[PDB]
């Protein structure tokens, strides 16, 4: 049962959602909804990025979740998703407009479990899972690193014995004169102090482990004619594959409703409390682990943490970083409550007053221990940072609804007034100069150094007046008209309020009398919708020219703190220096709402006695007057960024969902759910400065206007130079040599320069598809979900340090194993460029070499279960007893062009592990 | 129905509690419970101090509240007391031992409302009240202040015109030579800059207002055979009489219970969330208002805040202080949840697992604005202090109970394991050097001055194993035996655990067959109890020798910060100075539990068909091995304080409760509830240093051992010297003169010295009584509650600055009106000493002059209500509709000896106002 019946509505089967056993219900529906992209890195929390109907705006694209009628934008990883009864996604502007003013990026409706009338039930779910690392990046060992360094040295013509890294090479020349390596030897200690012995260390294995996930839920519901109630307690814990990273969550949900005065009066409430404690991996931990060479031992001779010495590259120990970061635990309390009252003066009139509250508390204590890893140290810096953050959102809604059933005409008229208020604040203290260096002793009162205080606050408000009218004729013709008047505190008084209309039409062809003989065609409906929605998801202080007294107490990297504090006297400090103000941004009083117009056409069909159902959708989204933050022209200096309505986004998309469920003669019930979606995005208008800096694409070389959002311009790599004759024949370029990347001459001017660039990267897949198979046979239920993406290109940063030697910010870094298969006179059948120590050809530039085919098809979740027969369960008095074993991310298929692994996450972010889970469900 | 039936249990009628309309339910029962003292200053919050059975320990005496089986010690002002169904107070150690290990100071049982089976109900309560200031302290106006100053000057023999305060006196001598004042004149401006004009300002009226209190509660309950539920929403707001002080609170409570598996399994939960925002009055605001003379204007000539100039005393403007303190608003979130599960393997066995959580969050932002009030200023100091505090308590309880009903013998055997864990933390940031000086701009990131960070954390744990056995023979002989094994983390391993037994006996005389003819005697029961309880309410870090790195970042008054930071180089600062550690206290590994033995004897009677009921109780409490924090001997220096078991407290008390309810021929129902209680406290053992410093009494002159706790030693004032002959006849003393206080010579040595002191102050009332009258007549209900205290002495600090001139730390301060009635040759019929400018006689010493009779009798709450007749309510479909008007603290009677006002609060704390309230109750 769709709650709109005339728009693009996707209903998610919650039974399959809980089968995957994911903490975040959103992450479970990664590819089960057409026109919906869910990206998850794989960290222990269920945090993920959601994109509905592609990218339709230049500001934040987070969709507006709605739970029990309360809107929000926070992630669902911090909420208990196991007590969800129904999930509805509103991807159409006309359908989602009536649910709030923040429906620009789509609306997701989440309904919590409630006690069913006339029965009382309980459900206890237990789940234990083991997570194993699968995308183990292959890196060179000590011998492989030495061989690669020797190959680079001999390719560059330098003496390999002058590496000054403890490597002694016994090598010679073959008959053809190509250098050949016979053997290598290493000094026992990398330094002259004999404190860092050489060893073969698997850093990826050292920093990874086998995580343990435990989930325990207990829900009880009780219904009655005078009311109903529901109480759920949930516990979740996930240990990440990366060491010293974990996330656990307690959840308590209480829902109830009461009917008084012979069903005239109703009072209901839905409340939930969550407590999530998490230790997160440090930024770029995978990058640090990959960069550090395997020759560095984990522990030194004296038992201290190992580190680079002498000429080894300046890379911190990933194991020591994880050990020091294990105490950076943050606690998050989530408060999601709602109380509603409903009154019915007569049969057709309803008045609902609803109050919703969302209170978020975050407390963190970050520690900075003194470390000395060889030549890497922080000069004995020890510090503590105690941070507190508060978020408070409250919403009040007044709804008046009238329904009439006169003749064959059904008419619903609803009006509503909504008020939203959000207030955010944060404050933190910083202390230094500790002695014991333990979490127990590291408190700000126990410090003896410089102390700093930080603190900020902000907020906004929303006012909405909405009206919805629905007309139904003969249960065959449906018309919907809605109007919205929305205002926000982020705009000036002149442009505070804006009006948004939406219209929807629907015709049930199967109800027409001219096809009564079509018994096979059970149902057929054609619907169209044209709607307008408003977007204002911008900075709260957007229309004000912001001047702030940035003294310079905030930590900055590279010294570009831009603080305002100068020793005008010239006493080299010693006190409070004079301060001032700096401009953060230039205000603009002409900013207004961003108008997104959505046109949707849908065909819903159901054939063979409601067995073969499906829907086909075509949508066109056009966003104009987009509030974009343009940067300064260059001479305007600091604070030149300002918000302006100079954007234009276009999205043309197709979606197709199909489902076929049927039994079998011998007792097998098979249900197949197929889904496919495609979309095309385009940028039509953009400010000149934004197109020049290329923040939305183009890399600052060409304007992204007229091209897909996120498209990147780069060079074209036409293979590599296999001979000097090839170098001479090709157009002249800087750094051209044998074994180097050959760049195509686009304009045929005879020289390779900055103008030989074209559009090479397009982050738009050809189509994303999903397939869910459910089989029931003799109390055995098997679930199998496949998700695939075809026609998508990906930029691989791992390739930059796996296909080249010394292609990073620093040299002598550890590289990938496939680097051993580089081009050489001995091995001419290779496409990887020859190893070198100097990047004369400048191979770090953006080109088609780093663009790979991201197409993949992976088994997201497979589950085999056994249900106890009813007679045994009744003998044990149990209503239901089930067991199941599942595998998540067990198998995947990638393209041959993709040289790396894990096409979903081809970057240095958190890896995606394989989960093996065993679970039980009891229905006492 | 008492939940112990064999111990000292007080049942509080909740219907009368809600009649008073107080935010704190505890404050409502100020004198309705025998042997229970409730002290409330009168601030907008319902904060109050509770003492059960007198003072029985030298450490914190706060009783252990229990709500829904969850123990706590936080005040009930932050919780919603309007949803309470029953209140039980356990003042006996034997009865309260089984409810927790913190029952040393008594246990209060609070039960929340639950849905009654088979019905569904709603109650809406509205209340609007006005609070008016009644205890307006009388202070001298400009003319009265000038007259008093002239009288003091002429009494001291100095020239009154040399006061240098702008007062010019035209005065002369009478026939007898006594000076007489004819007239006075004042300069228009108190300063030479003509910026502070003279005016007659009523500071008490200026800083006080008429407060408004609003209360709105809405509760709904629904019961069924399969479970029950209850949901309550409450809002309270109180504006204090002192300006810029207020307290509001939102409360949401959800209770539910479910019965599954044919009543074998039960799952229940009780949860409440509270949000209290409060701005409190600054410390000593009443004292500051009284001290400042009335001649100081509220506003200066230029419109700025007025302040003293020239020779006027250094007193800050109370109105300006209140105006600057209005932004010191703190927010407090309270989380009180509990979930329990019960299983019955068969008829007589029960297993209960209960988990309770108490989470408290406090966020405050204190502002320090730059002020310049005449000569009073802070050198333009502006600062912000952002403080965050977290408290987290969690308790787990496992209870196994068995009941047998064999023959005439009833046997209950219960065992239980309880675990408690409390963790507290706090951190704050401090910033300075602000420019705009508004709450919006005052944030730590916006500051430009020195920043400080403070932070601390602590906690403790409790483990308890308890067993209770109850035996009943013929429903006539009752025996109870309980044993407790309690351990805490605050002690060492050797003395971690302690054992506490308790025994109770009871005999129902009315059940004996030898008095079957006593029809009038409906019921008579004699009970006795002897129990032992453990007390460990001490500092968490009590057994450790504490060394802390107190750098000196904490604000201190007078410069005694005791920080550890010295400029050993001698560069006058300019950086981080070297620091160290200091000893806070000396540890003691021999500390153990404090053992309190309570012996109670009770007689419960009920006569005339359960119409005249009552109870008489006698209790003896003996606390030994009391954990007291003794100070250093004097040469031990800092950190000499340590915890030791060297205390002994004795309490002998009597209580009597009576109640008579009866109807009348013409239709009047009268219920009278009388209560009386008395107690005597004594200290038997105490450490020598504690007795020497006199922290528990004696004022450091004589040991408090063998005397009542809090007793004070002082001189004896035998009137005043009315002539020189009286001075000559009396024993010689320093400062003796005509009109000065005469001090009795106790030892008859002929000279008044420090040894002429005796016990003068005893803070033990002779008896405290209460009387509640409830009258019902023709739908009119009248409630009248009187509370009286007799035989209590009070030390009046107001007298020190109302009966003397220049008796404070500084001179020329405003004094009371009664100071005008001082002794003089013109007015010899007076007991107030003659005015003087020099305290040669040293009248500031503790003496019987400042000891007054604190006996009082006040109408705590009177309420007249009208209930709509049932037929009209049914016509309007309402189940109940009632209105009421009430007065709180309307009338009081004091003793003639008490020269001041408000005997309950005779100090400079928050005043107690008169409340006039109108309320309505609706039962839809
Ligand atoms: O600084 C960028 C870098 O650091 C992070 C934190 O690791 O961001 C710092 C700030 O992000 C905040 C502000 O909301 O929250 C993000 C983290 O807190 C969590 C807790 O659940 O999310 C809070 C809440 O806000 C979102 O993150 C945004 O809508 C939602 O996803 C979520 O519901 C957690 O998910 C985030 O890690 C604030 O807490 C930090 O000060 C990272 O975000 C980023 O990588
Ligand atoms: O410094 C003494 C003087 O100042 C007060 C605050 O005005 O105490 C200062 C510190 O007391 C703290 C520590 O708990 O709380 C007291 C105030 O906060 C409130 C908020 O509801 O109470 C908090 C919580 O702790 C109790 O006070 C003790 O168990 C409980 O009553 C209550 O549940 C509020 O009631 C108090 O005013 C801390 O907040 C301050 O830093 C006063 O206590 C005292 O007069
Ligand atoms: Mg070219
Ligand atoms: Mg003497």
Description of the structure:
- The structure is cut from a larger assembly and holds two copies of chain A (924 residues).
- Chain A is 8% helix and 45% strand.
- Chain A has 924 residues and is mainly β.
- In chain A, the strands form ten sheets. Chain A has a 22-stranded antiparallel β-barrel. In chain A, strands 1-6-7-4-5 form a five-stranded mixed sheet.
- In chain A, helix 6 (285-291) runs antiparallel to helix 7 (318-325).
- The interface between A and B is large, with 68 and 67 residues.
- The complex binds a molecule of 4 linked components (FRU-FRU-FRU-FRU) (2 copies) and magnesium ion (2 copies).
- A molecule of 4 linked components (FRU-FRU-FRU-FRU) binds next to loops of chain B.
Overall geometry of chain A comes to globular
Quaternary state of this entry equals part of a larger assembly
Strand content of chain A: 35-45%
Helix content of chain A: under 10%
Family (chains A, B): Belongs to the TonB-dependent receptor family.
Keywords (chains A, B): Cell outer membrane, Membrane, Metal-binding, Signal, TonB box, Transmembrane, Transmembrane beta strand, Transport
Protein name (chains A, B): SusC homolog
Subcellular location (chains A, B): Cell outer membrane
How are the SSEs placed, and which strands pair?
The structure is cut from a larger assembly and holds two copies of chain A (924 residues).
Chain A: E1 9-12, H1 14-19, H2 25-28, E2 36-39, E3 49-52, E4 64-67, E5 70-72, E6 84-90, H3 93-97, E7 107-112, E8 120-132, H4 142-156, E9 167-173, E10 179-186, H5 203-206, E11 211-223, E12 227-239, E13 246-260, E14 265-279, H6 285-291, H7 318-325, E15 329-343, E16 349-368, E17 372-373, E18 376-377, E19 383-406, E20 409-432, E21 452-473, E22 477-488, E23 497-508, E24 521-535, E25 546-548, E26 582-585, E27 594-607, E28 612-624, E29 627-630, E30 642-645, E31 648-662, E32 668-685, H8 688-693, E33 712-714, E34 717-720, H9 724-729, E35 741-743, E36 758-761, E37 767-777, E38 780-790, E39 793-795, H10 797-800, E40 851-853, E41 856-867, H11 870-875, E42 881-888, E43 892-894, E44 914-922
Parallel strand pairs in A: 4-7
Antiparallel strand pairs in A: 1-6, 2-3, 4-5, 6-7, 8-11, 8-44, 9-10, 11-12, 12-13, 13-14, 14-15, 15-16, 16-19, 17-18, 19-20, 20-21, 21-22, 22-23, 23-24, 24-27, 25-26, 27-28, 28-31, 29-30, 31-32, 32-37, 33-36, 34-35, 37-38, 38-41, 39-40, 41-42, 41-43, 42-44
One magnesium ion (MG) is lined by residues 745, 747, 749, 751-753, 755-756 of chain B.
PDB class: transport protein
Keywords: Membrane protein transporter, glycan transporter, SusCD, utilisome, TonB dependent transporter, tbdt, levan, transport protein
Entry title: Core SusCD transporter units from the inactive levan utilisome in the presence of levan fructo-oligosaccharides DP 15-25
């Amino acid at each position: 049962r769709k709650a709109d019946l005339t728009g693009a509505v996707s209903v998610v089967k919650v039974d399959e959602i809980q089968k995957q056993g994911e903490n975040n219900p959103v992450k479970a529906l990664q590819g089960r909804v057409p026109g919906m992209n869910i990206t998850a890195d794989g960290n222990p929390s269920g945090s993920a990025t959601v994109r509905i109907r592609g990218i339709g705006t230049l500001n934040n694209n987070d969709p507006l979740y709605i739970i029990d009628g309360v809107p929000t934008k926070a992630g669902m990883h911090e909420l208990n998703g196991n007590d969800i009864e129904s999930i509805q996604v509103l991807k159409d502007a006309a359908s989602a407009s009536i649910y709030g003013s923040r429906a620009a990026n789509g609306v997701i409706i989440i309904t919590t479990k409630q006690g069913k009338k006339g029965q009382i039930k309980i459900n206890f779910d237990a789940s234990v899972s083991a997570s194993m690392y699968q995308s183990k990046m292959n890196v060179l060992n000590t011998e492989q690193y030495g061989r690669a360094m020797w190959q680079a040295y001999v390719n560059d013509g330098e003496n390999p014995n002058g590496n000054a890294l403890g490597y002694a090479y016994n090598w010679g020349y073959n008959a053809d004169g190509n250098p050949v390596l016979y053997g290598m030897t290493l000094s026992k200690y990398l330094d002259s102090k004999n404190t860092m012995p050489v060893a073969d260390t698997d850093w990826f294995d050292e920093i990874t482990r086998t995580g343990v996930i435990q989930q325990y839920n207990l829900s009880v519901s009780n219904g009655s004619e005078k009311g109903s109630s529901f109480f759920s307690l949930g516990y979740y814990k996930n240990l990440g594959v990366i060491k010293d990273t974990d996330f656990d969550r307690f959840s308590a949900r209480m829902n109830s409703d009461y009917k008084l005065i012979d069903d005239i009066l109703t009072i209901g409430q839905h409340f939930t409390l969550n407590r999530t404690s998490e230790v997160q991996a440090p930024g770029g931990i995978i990058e640090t682990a990959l960069d550090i060479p395997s020759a560095i031992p984990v522990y030194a001779s004296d038992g201290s943490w190992g580190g680079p010495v002498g000429g080894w590259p300046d890379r911190r120990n990933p194991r020591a970083v994880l050990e020091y970061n294990k105490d950076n635990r943050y606690t998050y309390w989530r408060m999601f409550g709602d109380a509603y009252v409903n009154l019915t003066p007569f049969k057709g009139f309803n008045l609902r007053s609803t109050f919703g509250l969302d209170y978020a508390n975050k407390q963190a204590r970050y520690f900075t221990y003194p470390y000395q890893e060889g030549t890497q140290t922080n000069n004995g810096k020890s510090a503590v940072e105690a941070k507190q953050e508060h978020w408070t959102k409250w919403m009040w809604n007044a709804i008046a609804t009238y329904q009439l059933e006169v003749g064959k005409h059904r008419g619903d008229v609803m009006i509503g007034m909504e008020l939203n208020r959000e207030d955010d604040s944060h404050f933190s203290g910083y202390k230094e100069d500790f002695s014991i260096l333990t979490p127990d002793y590291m408190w700000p009162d126990a410090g003896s150094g410089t102390a700093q205080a930080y603190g900020a606050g902000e907020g906004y408000s929303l006012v909405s007046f909405f009206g919805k009218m629905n007309y139904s004729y003969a249960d065959r013709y449906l018309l919907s008209l809605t109007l919205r008047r929305d205002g926000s505190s982020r705009f000036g008084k002149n442009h505070r309020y804006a009006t948004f209309p939406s219209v929807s039409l629907g015709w049930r062809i199967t109800q027409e009398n001219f096809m009564k003989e079509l018994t096979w065609l059970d149902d057929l409906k054609l619907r169209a919708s044209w709607g307008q929605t408003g977007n204002q998801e911008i900075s709260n202080l957007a229309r004000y020219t912001i001047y702030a007294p940035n003294y310079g107490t905030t930590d900055s990297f590279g010294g570009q703190s831009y603080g305002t504090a100068y020793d005008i006297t010239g006493s080299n400090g010693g006190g409070v220096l004079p301060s001032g103000f700096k401009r953060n941004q230039i205000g603009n009083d002409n900013i207004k709402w961003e108008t997104t117009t959505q046109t949707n056409v849908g065909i819903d069909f159901s054939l063979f006695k409601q067995s073969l159902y499906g829907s086909l959708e075509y949508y066109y989204k056009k966003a104009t007057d987009i509030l974009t933050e343009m940067a300064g022209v260059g001479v305007l200096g600091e604070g030149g960024s300002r918000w302006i309505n100079s954007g234009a986004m276009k999205n043309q998309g197709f979606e197709f969902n199909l489902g076929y469920r049927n039994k079998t003669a011998f007792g097998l019930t098979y249900d197949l759910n197929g889904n496919i979606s495609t979309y095309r995005n385009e940028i039509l208008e953009l400010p000149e400065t934004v197109a020049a800096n290329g923040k939305f694409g183009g890399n600052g070389v060409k304007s992204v206007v007229g091209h897909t959002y996120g498209a990147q311009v780069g060079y074209i790599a036409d293979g590599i130079f296999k001979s000097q004759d090839e170098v001479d024949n090709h157009a002249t370029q800087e750094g051209a040599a044998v074994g180097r990347i050959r760049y195509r001459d686009i304009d045929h001017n005879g020289v390779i320069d900055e103008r030989d660039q074209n559009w090479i990267y397009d982050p738009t897949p050809s189509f994303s598809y999903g397939l869910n198979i459910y089989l029931e046979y003799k109390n055995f239920d098997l679930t199998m979900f496949w998700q695939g993406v075809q026609g998508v290109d990906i930029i691989s940063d791992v390739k930059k340090k796996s296909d080249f030697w010394s292609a990073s910010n620093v040299g002598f870094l550890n590289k990938g194993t496939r680097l051993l298969n580089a081009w050489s006179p001995t091995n001419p059948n290779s496409d990887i460029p020859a190893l070198t120590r100097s990047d004369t050809n400048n191979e770090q530039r953006v080109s088609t070499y780093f663009v790979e085919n991201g197409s993949f098809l992976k088994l997201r979740n497979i589950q085999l279960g056994y249900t106890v027969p009813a007679v045994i369960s009744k003998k044990m008095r149990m209503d239901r007893l089930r067991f199941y074993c599942s595998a998540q991310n067990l198998l995947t298929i990638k393209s041959k062009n993709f040289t790396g692994e894990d096409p979903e996450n081809p970057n240095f972010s958190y890896p995606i592990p394989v989960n093996i889970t065993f679970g039980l469900n009891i229905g006492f």
